[PDB]
Amino acid sequence: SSENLTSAESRIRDVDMASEMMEYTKNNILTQASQAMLAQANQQPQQVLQLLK
Amino acid sequence: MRINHNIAALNTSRQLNAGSNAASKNMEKLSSGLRINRAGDDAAGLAISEKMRSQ
Numbered sequence A: 001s002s003e004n005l006t007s008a009e010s011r012i013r014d015v016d017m018a019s020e021m022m023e024y025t026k027n028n029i030l031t032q033a034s035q036a037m038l039a040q041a042n043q044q045p046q047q048v049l050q051l052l053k
Numbered sequence B: 001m002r003i004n005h006n007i008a009a010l011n012t013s014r015q016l017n018a019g020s021n022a023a024s025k026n027m028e029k030l031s032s033g034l035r036i037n038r039a040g041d042d043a044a045g046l047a048i049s050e051k052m053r054s055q
Helices: A001-014 A018-051 B007-032 B043-054
Strands: none
Touching: A001 B007
16 A cells, blocks of 8 residues: 555656656757847847938 | 656565565474464464374
């Protein structure tokens, strides 16, 4: 009854290493995609200076 | 892959401490030469034996 409950509690509490590392990598890329586009988002307002002169 | 608990190894441990116990019980009989060492091996066997030995 300890094995059957230890296994029962592990499924509820312990994390799946495979299904979590794969999900961590996804959000670790989605933040770099937003990081890359944030840099370009700041460059866009810089083009009105050539028009203002 | 759950890491905090190894149910495969935890299950194997119980079977490990279940053939060791049986081997220990078997070696008690082999060393002493008696089926009934404790009274839990045969209650009626223990009772009949003592009457028999007494007789």
